mmCIF file of C-alpha atoms in Angstrom:
data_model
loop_
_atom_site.group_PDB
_atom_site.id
_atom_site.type_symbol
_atom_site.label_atom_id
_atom_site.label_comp_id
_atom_site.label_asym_id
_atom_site.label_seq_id
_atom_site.Cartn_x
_atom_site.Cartn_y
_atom_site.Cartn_z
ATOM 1 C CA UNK A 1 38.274 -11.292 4.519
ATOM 2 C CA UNK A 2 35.741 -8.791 6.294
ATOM 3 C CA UNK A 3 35.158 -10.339 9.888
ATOM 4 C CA UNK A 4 33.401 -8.188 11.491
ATOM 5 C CA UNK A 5 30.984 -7.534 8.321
ATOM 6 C CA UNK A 6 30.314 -11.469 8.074
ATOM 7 C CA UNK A 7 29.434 -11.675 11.805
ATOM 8 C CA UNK A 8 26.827 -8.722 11.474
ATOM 9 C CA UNK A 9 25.201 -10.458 8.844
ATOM 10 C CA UNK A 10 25.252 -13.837 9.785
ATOM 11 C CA UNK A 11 23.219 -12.324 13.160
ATOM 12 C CA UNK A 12 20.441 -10.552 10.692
ATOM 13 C CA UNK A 13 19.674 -13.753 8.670
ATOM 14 C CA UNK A 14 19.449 -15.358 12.162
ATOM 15 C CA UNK A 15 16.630 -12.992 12.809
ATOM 16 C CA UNK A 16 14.996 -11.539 9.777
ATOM 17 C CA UNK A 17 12.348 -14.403 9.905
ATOM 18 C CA UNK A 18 11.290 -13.346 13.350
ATOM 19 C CA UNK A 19 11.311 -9.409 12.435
ATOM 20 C CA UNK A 20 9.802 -9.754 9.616
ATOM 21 C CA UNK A 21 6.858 -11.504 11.757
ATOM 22 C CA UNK A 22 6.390 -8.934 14.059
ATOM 23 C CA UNK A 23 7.229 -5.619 13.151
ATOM 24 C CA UNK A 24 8.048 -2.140 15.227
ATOM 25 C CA UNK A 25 5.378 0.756 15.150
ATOM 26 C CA UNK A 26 5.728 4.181 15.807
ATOM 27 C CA UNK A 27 2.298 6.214 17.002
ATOM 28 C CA UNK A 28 2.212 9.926 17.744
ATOM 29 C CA UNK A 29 -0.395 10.793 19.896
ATOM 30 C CA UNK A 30 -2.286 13.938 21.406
ATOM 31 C CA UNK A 31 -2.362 14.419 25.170
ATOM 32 C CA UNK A 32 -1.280 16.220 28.209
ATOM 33 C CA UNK A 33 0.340 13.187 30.239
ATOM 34 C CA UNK A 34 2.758 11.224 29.587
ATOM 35 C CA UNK A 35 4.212 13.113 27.234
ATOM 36 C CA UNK A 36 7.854 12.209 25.383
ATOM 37 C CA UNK A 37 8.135 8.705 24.151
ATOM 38 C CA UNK A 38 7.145 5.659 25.799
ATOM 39 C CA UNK A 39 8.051 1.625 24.982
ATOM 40 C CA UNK A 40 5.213 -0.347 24.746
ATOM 41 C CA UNK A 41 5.836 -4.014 24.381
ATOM 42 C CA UNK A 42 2.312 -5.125 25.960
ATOM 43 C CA UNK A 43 -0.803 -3.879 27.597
ATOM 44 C CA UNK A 44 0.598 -3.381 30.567
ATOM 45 C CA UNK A 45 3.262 -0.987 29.482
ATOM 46 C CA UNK A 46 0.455 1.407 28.684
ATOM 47 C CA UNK A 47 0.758 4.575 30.867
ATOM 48 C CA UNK A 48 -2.395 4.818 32.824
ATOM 49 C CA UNK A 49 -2.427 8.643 32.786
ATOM 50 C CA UNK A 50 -3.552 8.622 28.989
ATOM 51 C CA UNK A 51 -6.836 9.116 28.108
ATOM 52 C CA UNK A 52 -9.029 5.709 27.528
ATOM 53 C CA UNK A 53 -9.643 7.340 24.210
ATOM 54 C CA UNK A 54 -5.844 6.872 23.528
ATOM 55 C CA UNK A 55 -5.442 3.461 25.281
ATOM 56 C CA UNK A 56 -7.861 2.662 23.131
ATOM 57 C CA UNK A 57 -5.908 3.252 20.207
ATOM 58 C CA UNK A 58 -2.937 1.254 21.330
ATOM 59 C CA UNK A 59 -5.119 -1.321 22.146
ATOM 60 C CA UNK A 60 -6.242 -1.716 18.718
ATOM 61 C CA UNK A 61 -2.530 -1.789 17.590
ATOM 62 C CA UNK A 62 -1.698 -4.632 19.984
ATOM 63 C CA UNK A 63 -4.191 -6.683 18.170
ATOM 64 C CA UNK A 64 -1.846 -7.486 15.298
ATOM 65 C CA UNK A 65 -2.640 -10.400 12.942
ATOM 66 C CA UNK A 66 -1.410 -14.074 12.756
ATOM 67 C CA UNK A 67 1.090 -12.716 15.503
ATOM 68 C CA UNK A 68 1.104 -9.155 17.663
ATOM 69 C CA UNK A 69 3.763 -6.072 16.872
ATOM 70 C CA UNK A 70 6.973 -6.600 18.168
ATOM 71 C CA UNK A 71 7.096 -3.202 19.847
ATOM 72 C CA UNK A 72 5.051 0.111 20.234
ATOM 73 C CA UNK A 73 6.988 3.407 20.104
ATOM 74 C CA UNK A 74 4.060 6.075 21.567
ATOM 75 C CA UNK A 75 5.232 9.367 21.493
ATOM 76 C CA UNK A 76 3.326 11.752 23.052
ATOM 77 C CA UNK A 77 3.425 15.063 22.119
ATOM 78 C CA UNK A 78 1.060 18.132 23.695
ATOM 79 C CA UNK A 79 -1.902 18.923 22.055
ATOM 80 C CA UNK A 80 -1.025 22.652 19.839
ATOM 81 C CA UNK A 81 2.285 20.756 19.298
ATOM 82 C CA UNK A 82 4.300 21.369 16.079
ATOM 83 C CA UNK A 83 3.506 17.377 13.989
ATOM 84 C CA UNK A 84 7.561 17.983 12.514
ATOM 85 C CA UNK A 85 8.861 17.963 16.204
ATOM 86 C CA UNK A 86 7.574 14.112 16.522
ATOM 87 C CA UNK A 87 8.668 13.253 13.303
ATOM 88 C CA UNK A 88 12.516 15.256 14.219
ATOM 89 C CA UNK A 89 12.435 12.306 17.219
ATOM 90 C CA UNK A 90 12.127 9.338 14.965
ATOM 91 C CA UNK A 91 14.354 10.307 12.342
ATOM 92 C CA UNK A 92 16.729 8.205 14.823
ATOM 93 C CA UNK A 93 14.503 5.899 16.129
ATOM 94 C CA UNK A 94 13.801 2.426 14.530
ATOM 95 C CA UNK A 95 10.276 1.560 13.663
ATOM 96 C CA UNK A 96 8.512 0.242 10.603
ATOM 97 C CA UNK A 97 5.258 1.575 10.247
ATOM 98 C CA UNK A 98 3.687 4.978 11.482
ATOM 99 C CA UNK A 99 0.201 5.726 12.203
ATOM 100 C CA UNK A 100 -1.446 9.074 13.918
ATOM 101 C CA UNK A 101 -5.001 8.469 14.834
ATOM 102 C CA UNK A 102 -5.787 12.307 15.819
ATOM 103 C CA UNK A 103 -3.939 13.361 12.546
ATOM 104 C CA UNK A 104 -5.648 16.535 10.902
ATOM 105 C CA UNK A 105 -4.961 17.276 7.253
ATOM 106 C CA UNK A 106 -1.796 19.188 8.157
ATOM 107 C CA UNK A 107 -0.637 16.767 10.079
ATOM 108 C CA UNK A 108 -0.558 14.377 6.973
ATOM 109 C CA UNK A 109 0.626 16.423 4.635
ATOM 110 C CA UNK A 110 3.658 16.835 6.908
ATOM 111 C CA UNK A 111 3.719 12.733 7.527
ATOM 112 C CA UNK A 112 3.877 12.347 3.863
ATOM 113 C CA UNK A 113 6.278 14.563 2.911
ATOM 114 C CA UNK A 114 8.634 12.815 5.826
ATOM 115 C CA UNK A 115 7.936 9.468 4.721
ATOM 116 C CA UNK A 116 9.054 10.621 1.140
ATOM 117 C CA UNK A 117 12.192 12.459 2.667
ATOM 118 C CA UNK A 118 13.127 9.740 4.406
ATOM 119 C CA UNK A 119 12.747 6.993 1.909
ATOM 120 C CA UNK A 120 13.982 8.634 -1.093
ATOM 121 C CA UNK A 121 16.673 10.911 0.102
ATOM 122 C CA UNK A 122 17.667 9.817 3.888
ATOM 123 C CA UNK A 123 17.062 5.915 2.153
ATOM 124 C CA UNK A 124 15.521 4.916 5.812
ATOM 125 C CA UNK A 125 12.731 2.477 4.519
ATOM 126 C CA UNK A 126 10.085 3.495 6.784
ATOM 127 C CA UNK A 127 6.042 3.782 6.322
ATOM 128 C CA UNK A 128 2.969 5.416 7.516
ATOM 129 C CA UNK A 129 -0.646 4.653 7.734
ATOM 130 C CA UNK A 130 -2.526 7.155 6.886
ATOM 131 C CA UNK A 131 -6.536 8.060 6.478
ATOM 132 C CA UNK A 132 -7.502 9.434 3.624
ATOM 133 C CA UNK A 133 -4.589 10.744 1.834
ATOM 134 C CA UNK A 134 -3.218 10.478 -1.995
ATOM 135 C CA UNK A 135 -0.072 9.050 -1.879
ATOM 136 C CA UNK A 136 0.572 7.783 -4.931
ATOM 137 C CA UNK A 137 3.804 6.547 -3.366
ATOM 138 C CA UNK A 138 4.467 2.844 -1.521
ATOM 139 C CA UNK A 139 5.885 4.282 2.115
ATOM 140 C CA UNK A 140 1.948 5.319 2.327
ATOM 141 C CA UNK A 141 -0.382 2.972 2.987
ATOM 142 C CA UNK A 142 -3.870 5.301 2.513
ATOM 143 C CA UNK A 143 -6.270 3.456 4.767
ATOM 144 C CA UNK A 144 -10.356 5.216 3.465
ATOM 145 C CA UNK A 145 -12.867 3.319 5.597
ATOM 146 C CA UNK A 146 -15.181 5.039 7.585
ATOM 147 C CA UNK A 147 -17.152 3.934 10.392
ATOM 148 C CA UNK A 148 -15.357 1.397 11.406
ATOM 149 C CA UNK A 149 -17.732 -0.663 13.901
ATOM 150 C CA UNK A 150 -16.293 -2.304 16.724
ATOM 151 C CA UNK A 151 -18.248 -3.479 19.586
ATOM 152 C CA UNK A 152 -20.353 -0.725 19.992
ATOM 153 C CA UNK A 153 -17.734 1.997 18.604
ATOM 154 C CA UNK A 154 -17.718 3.500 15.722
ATOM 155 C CA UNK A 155 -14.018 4.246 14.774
ATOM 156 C CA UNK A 156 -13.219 7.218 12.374
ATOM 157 C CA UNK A 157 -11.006 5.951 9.596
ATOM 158 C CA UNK A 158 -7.800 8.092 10.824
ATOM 159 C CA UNK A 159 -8.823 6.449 14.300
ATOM 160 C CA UNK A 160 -8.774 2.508 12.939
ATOM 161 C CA UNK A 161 -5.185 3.423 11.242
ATOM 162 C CA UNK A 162 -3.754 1.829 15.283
ATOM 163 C CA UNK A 163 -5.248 -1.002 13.760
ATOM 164 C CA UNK A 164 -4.597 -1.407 10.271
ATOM 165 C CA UNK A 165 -0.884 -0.528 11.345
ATOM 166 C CA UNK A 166 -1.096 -3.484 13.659
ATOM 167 C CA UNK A 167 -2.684 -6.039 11.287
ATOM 168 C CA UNK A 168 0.280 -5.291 8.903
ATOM 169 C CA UNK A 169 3.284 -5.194 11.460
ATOM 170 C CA UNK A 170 1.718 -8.788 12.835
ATOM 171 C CA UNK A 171 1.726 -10.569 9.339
ATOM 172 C CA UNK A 172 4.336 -12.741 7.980
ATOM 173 C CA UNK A 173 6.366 -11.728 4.827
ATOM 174 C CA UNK A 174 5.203 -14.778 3.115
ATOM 175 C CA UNK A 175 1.567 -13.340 3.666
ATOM 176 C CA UNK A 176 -0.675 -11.143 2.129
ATOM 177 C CA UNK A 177 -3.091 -8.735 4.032
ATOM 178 C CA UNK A 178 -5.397 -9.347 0.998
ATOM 179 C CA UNK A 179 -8.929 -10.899 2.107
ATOM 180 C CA UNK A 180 -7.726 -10.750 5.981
ATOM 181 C CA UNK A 181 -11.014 -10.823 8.115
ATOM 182 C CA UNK A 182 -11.511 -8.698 10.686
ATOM 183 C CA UNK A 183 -13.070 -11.027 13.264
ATOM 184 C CA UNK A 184 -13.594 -8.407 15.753
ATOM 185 C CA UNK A 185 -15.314 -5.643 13.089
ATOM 186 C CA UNK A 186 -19.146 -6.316 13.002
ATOM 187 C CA UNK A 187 -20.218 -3.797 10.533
ATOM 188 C CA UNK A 188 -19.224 -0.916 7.910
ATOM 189 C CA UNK A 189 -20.503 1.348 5.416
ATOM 190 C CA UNK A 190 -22.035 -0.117 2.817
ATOM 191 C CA UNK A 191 -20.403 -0.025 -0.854
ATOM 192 C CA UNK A 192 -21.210 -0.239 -3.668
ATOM 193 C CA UNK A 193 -18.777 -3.055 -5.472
ATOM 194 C CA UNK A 194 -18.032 -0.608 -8.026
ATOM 195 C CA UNK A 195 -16.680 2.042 -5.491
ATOM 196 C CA UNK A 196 -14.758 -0.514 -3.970
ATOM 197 C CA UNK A 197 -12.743 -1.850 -6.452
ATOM 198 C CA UNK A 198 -12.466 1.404 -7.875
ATOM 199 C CA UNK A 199 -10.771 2.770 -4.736
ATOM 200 C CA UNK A 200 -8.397 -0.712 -4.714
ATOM 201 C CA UNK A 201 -7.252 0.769 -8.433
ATOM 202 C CA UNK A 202 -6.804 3.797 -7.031
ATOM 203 C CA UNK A 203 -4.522 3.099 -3.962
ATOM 204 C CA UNK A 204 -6.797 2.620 -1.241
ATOM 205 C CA UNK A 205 -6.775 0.125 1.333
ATOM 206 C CA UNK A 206 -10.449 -0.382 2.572
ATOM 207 C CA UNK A 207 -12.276 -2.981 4.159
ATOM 208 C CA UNK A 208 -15.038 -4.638 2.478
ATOM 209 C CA UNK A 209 -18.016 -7.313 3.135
ATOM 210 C CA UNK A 210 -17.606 -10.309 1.481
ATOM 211 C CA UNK A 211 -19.514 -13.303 1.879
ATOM 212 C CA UNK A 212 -20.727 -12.645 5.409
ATOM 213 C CA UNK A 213 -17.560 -11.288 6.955
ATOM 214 C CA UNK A 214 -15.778 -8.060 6.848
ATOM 215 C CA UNK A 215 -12.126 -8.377 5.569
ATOM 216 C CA UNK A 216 -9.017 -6.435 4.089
ATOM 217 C CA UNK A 217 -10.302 -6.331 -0.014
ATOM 218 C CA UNK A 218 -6.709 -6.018 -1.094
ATOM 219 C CA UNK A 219 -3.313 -5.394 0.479
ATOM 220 C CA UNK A 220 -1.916 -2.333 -1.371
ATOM 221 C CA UNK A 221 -0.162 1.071 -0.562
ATOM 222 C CA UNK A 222 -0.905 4.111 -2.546
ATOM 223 C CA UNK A 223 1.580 3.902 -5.124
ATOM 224 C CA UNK A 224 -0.668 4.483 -8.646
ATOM 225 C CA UNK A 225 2.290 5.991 -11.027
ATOM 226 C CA UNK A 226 4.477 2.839 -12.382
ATOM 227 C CA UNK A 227 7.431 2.405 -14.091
ATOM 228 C CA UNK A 228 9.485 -0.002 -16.069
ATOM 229 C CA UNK A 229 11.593 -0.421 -13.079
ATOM 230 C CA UNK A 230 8.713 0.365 -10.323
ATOM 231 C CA UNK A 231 5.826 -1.446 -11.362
ATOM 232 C CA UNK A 232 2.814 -3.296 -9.959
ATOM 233 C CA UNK A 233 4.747 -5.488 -7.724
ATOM 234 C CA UNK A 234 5.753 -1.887 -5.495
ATOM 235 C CA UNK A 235 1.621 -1.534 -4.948
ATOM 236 C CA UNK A 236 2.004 -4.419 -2.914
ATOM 237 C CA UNK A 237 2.060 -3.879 0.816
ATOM 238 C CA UNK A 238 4.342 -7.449 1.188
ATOM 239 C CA UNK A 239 6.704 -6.873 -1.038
ATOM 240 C CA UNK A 240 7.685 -3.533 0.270
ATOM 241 C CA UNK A 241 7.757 -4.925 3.187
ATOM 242 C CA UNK A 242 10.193 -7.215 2.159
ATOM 243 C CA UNK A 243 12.746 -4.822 0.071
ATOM 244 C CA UNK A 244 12.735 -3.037 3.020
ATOM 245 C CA UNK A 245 14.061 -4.748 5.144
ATOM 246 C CA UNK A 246 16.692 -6.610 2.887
ATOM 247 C CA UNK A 247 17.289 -2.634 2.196
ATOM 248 C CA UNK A 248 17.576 -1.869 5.805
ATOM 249 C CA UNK A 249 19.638 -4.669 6.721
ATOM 250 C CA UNK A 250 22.836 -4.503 4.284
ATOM 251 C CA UNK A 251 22.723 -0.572 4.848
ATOM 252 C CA UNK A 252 22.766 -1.236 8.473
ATOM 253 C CA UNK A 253 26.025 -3.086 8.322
ATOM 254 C CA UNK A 254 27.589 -1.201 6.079
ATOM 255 C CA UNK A 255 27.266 2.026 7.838
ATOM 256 C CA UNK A 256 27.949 0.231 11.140
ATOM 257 C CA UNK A 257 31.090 -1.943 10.024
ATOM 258 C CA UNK A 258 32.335 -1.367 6.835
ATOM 259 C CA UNK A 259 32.378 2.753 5.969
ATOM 260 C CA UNK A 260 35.479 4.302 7.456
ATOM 261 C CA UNK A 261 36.391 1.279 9.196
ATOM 262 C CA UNK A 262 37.231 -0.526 6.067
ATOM 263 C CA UNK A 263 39.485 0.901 3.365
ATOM 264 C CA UNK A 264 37.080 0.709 0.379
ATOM 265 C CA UNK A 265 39.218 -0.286 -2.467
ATOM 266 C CA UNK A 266 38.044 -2.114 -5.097
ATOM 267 C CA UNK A 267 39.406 -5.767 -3.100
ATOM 268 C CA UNK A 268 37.198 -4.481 -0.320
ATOM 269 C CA UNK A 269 34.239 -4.080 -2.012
ATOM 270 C CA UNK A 270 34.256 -7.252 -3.867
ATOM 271 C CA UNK A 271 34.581 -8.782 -0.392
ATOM 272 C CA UNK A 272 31.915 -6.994 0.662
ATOM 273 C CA UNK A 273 29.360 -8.261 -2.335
ATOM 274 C CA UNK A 274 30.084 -11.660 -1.624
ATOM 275 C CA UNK A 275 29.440 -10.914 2.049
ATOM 276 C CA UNK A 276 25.752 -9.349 0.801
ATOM 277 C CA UNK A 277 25.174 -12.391 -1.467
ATOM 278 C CA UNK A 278 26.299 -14.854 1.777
ATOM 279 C CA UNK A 279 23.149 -12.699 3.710
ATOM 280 C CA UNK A 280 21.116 -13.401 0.683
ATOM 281 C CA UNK A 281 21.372 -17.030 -0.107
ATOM 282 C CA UNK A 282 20.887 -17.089 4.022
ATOM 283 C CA UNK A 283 17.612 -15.577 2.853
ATOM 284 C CA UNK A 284 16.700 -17.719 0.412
ATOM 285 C CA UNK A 285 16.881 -20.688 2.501
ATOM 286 C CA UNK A 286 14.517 -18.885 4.705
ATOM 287 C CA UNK A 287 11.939 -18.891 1.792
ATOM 288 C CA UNK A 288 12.062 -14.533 1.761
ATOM 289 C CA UNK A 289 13.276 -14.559 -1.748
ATOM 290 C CA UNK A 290 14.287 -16.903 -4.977
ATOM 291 C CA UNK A 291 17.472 -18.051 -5.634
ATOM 292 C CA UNK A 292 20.021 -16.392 -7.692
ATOM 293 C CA UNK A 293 20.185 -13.229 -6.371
ATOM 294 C CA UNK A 294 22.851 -11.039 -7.693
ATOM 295 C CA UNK A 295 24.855 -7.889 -5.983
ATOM 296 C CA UNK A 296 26.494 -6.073 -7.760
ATOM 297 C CA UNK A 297 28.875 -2.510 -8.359
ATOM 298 C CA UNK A 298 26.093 -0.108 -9.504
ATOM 299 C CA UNK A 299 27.559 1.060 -12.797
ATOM 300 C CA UNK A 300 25.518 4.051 -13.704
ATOM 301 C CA UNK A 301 25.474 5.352 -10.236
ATOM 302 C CA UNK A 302 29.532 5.298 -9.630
ATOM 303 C CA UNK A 303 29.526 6.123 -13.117
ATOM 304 C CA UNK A 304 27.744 9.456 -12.806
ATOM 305 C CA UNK A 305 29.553 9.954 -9.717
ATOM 306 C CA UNK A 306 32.432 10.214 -10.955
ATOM 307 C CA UNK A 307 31.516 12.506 -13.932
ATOM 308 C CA UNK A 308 30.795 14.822 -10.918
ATOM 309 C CA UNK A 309 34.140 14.717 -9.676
ATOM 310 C CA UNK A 310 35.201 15.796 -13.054
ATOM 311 C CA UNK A 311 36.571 12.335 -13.867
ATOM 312 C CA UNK A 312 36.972 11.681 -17.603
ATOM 313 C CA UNK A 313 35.244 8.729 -18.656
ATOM 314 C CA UNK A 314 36.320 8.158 -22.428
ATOM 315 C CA UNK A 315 40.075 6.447 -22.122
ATOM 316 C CA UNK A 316 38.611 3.977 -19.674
ATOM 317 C CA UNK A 317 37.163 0.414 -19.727
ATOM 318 C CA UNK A 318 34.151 -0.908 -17.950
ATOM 319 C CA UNK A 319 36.404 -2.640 -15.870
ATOM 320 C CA UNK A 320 38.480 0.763 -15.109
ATOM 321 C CA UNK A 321 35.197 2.416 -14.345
ATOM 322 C CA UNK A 322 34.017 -0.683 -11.979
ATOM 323 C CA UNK A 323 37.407 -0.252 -10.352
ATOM 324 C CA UNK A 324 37.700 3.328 -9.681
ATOM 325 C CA UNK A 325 38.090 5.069 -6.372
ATOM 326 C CA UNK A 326 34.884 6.362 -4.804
ATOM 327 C CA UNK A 327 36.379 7.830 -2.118
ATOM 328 C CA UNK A 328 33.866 6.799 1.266
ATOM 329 C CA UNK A 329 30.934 5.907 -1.479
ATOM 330 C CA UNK A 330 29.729 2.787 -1.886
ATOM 331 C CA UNK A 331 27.184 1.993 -4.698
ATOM 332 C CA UNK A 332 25.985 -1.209 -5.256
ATOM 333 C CA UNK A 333 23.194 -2.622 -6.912
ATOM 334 C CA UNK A 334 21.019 -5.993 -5.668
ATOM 335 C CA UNK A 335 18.866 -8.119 -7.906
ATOM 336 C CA UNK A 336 16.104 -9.693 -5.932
ATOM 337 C CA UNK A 337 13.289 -11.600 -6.759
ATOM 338 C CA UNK A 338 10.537 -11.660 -4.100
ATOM 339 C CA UNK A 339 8.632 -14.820 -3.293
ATOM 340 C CA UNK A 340 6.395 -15.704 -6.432
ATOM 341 C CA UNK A 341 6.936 -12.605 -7.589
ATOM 342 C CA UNK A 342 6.125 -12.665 -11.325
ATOM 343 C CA UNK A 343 9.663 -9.589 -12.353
ATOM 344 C CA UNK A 344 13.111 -9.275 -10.694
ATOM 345 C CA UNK A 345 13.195 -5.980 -8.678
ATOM 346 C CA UNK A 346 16.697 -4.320 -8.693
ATOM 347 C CA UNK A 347 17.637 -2.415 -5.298
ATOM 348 C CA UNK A 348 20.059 0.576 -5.419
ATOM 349 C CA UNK A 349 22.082 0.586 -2.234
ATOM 350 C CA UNK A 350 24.151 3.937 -1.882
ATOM 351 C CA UNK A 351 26.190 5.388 1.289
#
């Protein structure tokens, strides 16, 4: 059938446990050494020549969950910098989660607008970590604690995004950041109960003091507008997490083996659908997602592409429309259901 396509994805479901354990995070940072980006896979990768203010901040990341982050991507950029030049690097970099803990309020308005971009038009599944900022969309995760006491420190809540970025990247897809303790925070703001679960509603991830420890009152992102098709299950910080990189994975092969490499005729595409359905009962055995997951042509989006190619629709049958030539576009659509996930969640795939 499609060799090369069946080897790429028999490599991903080999892995996708172990990424999806520890994930990749990107942090732009303020200072004038070490500039340009810089790999960090442990403590020791940490350029010396940053300030401890800084090194603090990656230290924080490092700390991670029930594992650590795969990988740090620090890039440094000077201080007066332009925010869009950073974000310009990454657009071909791979990372999951993005975090800034100098950001000013221009500097997230920028962040979120890239996250968007990226997401919904550039369909690269990446998030950000942000302090303090309205979303109302799941690639941003709006992080709203202040004074975040460690040790003797007392973190601003842009600051202790290094570590809420961490805490995510370093949990399992089967877990839920909901109720995590922070062993190492001693002490926050107090709250009133009220204005805590009032900010949860609203799309804020805080932390809260429950029954003598501080912990993580709920893992959401900032998403508060819902759908038919995008409902409660897209608040949830996991399950994002876990379209994503399904999402990530079948684009990545598709883009890397089968567009312009594979003539994409009907035949071909079939072949490729049972290819993303082999990945997908891979990932069921894995425990990821429930059995019965379906892929299949996206009607209404070849449909309305070819009503722009002035293509007349009304002689032709379902099957004729299913069959037609997209030229290099591929549009498929996946039917997942998420680990005890209570709704299916259907996943547009384009190229």
């Amino acid at each position: 059938g499609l060799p090369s396509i069946n080897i790429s994805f028999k490599e991903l479901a080999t892995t996708v446990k172990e990424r999806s354990a520890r994930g990749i995070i990107a942090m732009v940072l303020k200072d004038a050494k070490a500039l340009g980006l810089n790999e960090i896979h442990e403590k020791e990768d940490i350029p010396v020549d940053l300030s401890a203010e800084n090194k603090e901040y990656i230290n924080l990341a490092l700390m991670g969950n029930v594992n650590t982050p795969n990988k740090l991507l620090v890039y440094v950029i000077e201080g007066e910098a332009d925010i869009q030049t950073a974000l310009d690097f990454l657009e071909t970099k791979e990372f999951n989660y993005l975090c800034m803990p100098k950001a000013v309020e221009a500097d997230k308005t920028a962040i979120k607008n890239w996250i968007i971009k990226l997401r919904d038009i550039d369909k690269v599944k990446v998030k950000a970590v942000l302090g303090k900022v309205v979303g109302n969309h799941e690639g941003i995760i709006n992080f709203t604690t202040e004074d975040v006491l460690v040790g003797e420190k007392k973190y601003s809540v842009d600051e202790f995004t290094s570590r809420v970025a961490g805490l995510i990247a370093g949990t399992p897809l089967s877990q839920s950041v909901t109720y995590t303790k922070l062993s190492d925070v001693v002490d926050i703001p107090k709250m009133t109960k009220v204005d805590a679960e009032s900010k949860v509603n609203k799309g804020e991830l805080i932390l809260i003091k429950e029954a003598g420890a501080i912990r993580i009152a709920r893992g959401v992102n900032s998403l508060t507008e819902l759908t038919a098709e995008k409902g409660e299950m897209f608040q949830k910080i996991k399950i994002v997490d876990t379209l994503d990189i399904i999402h990530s994975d079948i684009r990545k092969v598709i883009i890397d083996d089968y567009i312009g490499k594979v003539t994409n005729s009907y035949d071909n595409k079939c072949l490729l659908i049972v290819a993303i359905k082999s990945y997908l009962e891979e990932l069921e055995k894995s425990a990821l997602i429930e059995s019965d997951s379906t892929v299949e042509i996206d009607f209404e989006a070849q449909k309305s592409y070819l009503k722009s190619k002035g293509v007349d629709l009304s002689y032709m049958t379902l099957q004729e429309i299913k069959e037609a030539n997209t030229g290099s576009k591929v549009f498929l659509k996946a039917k997942i259901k998420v680990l005890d996930a209570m709704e299916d969640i259907d996943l547009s795939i384009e190229i």
